[PDB]
Amino acid sequence: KVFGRCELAAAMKRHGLDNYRGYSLGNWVCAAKFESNFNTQATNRNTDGSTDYGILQINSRWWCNDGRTPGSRNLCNIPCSALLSSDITASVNCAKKIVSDGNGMNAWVAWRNRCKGTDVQAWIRGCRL
Ligand code: NA
Numbered sequence: 001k002v003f004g005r006c007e008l009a010a011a012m013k014r015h016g017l018d019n020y021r022g023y024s025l026g027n028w029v030c031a032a033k034f035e036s037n038f039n040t041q042a043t044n045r046n047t048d049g050s051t052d053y054g055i056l057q058i059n060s061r062w063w064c065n066d067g068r069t070p071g072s073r074n075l076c077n078i079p080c081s082a083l084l085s086s087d088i089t090a091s092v093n094c095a096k097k098i099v100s101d102g103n104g105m106n107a108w109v110a111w112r113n114r115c116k117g118t119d120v121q122a123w124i125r126g127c128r129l
Helices: 005-014 025-036 080-084 089-099 109-114 120-124
Strands: 043-045 051-053
Touching: 005 025, 005 120, 025 109, 025 120, 051 080, 080 089
Parallel strands: none
Antiparallel strands: 043 051
């Protein structure tokens, strides 16, 4: 599923991401834009041989099982394929664990490089939430 911007903002807010670990809704929407372009089916291979899955490009190195990432963990206890669903529940549940791991949203290199310190409220502008 390719989410619309306000459509994803609503879904994230319903699933309690708005101000989760102190990160406002616009931070999450911004991260999703630059990680996946709001596409739940987005996959990208990393240089280390792990893969990033779904709207928030969650990494098989630590967070989900894809069966092809040697010496990797599955800390969200989910198949990485579950992170590609039209229903973002799994991605949001897993993202809550990631952002709690100690470095906040710096875990998402695209958030640090493209969203951090920017006017992230622009990403929820005009949305009925
Ligand atoms: Na894994």
